[PDB]
Design a protein around this ligand. Structure first.
Ligand SMILES: Cc1cc2nc3c(=O)[nH]c(=O)nc-3n(C[C@H](O)[C@H](O)[C@H](O)COP(=O)(O)O)c2cc1C
Length: 133
């Protein structure tokens, strides 16, 4: 990974994460941790140069996808819970944490996304609580 100290910190905990490069059209993945590859069932060669939206499918809530899109557009750290699909078509609940990695002038150089698999019970409680705003 472009070796930011926070990326090295996530590697020591064997977290699931990807790094995107917004200078490339459609803000594709340029790095994916072994944890992300094992969670999703994809080989690194199948993920590099693609936008992470390939994990979405028919049971994914498009309103959770829209929260991510608007968060990035507004330059905000974003946390959502949404249903994602593995390569084999099995589904899981993904608590997704996205941050901009910025230079000294505040320009976004990369996005960092951490995926945490959560239970259906946890996802329902998170989404119910989100809806009380
Ligand atoms: C670093 C990064 C990691 C992401 N990881 C995921 C993910 O694991 N699952 C997912 O459904 N979307 C993920 N996304 C969201 C999509 O890439 C995309 O931003 C989202 O679908 C909204 O844009 P769209 O309306 O063009 O689809 C991630 C985005 C970024 C920038």
């Amino acid at each position: 990974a472009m070796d930011y100290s926070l990326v090295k910190a996530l590697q020591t905990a064997q977290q699931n994460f990807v790094i995107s490069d917004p200078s490339i059209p459609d803000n594709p993945i340029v790095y994916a941790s072994q944890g992300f590859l094992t969670l999703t069932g994809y080989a690194l060669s199948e993920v590099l140069g693609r936008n992470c939206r390939f994990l979405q499918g028919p049971e994914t809530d498009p309103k959770a996808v829209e929260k991510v899109r608007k968060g990035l557009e507004r330059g905000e750290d974003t946390t959502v819970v949404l249903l994602n699909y593995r390569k084999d078509g099995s589904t899981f609940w993904n608590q997704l944490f996205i941050a901009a990695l910025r230079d000294g002038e505040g320009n976004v150089v990369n996005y960092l996304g951490v995926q945490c698999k959560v239970s259906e019970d946890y996802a329902k409680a998170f989404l119910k609580n989100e809806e009380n705003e």
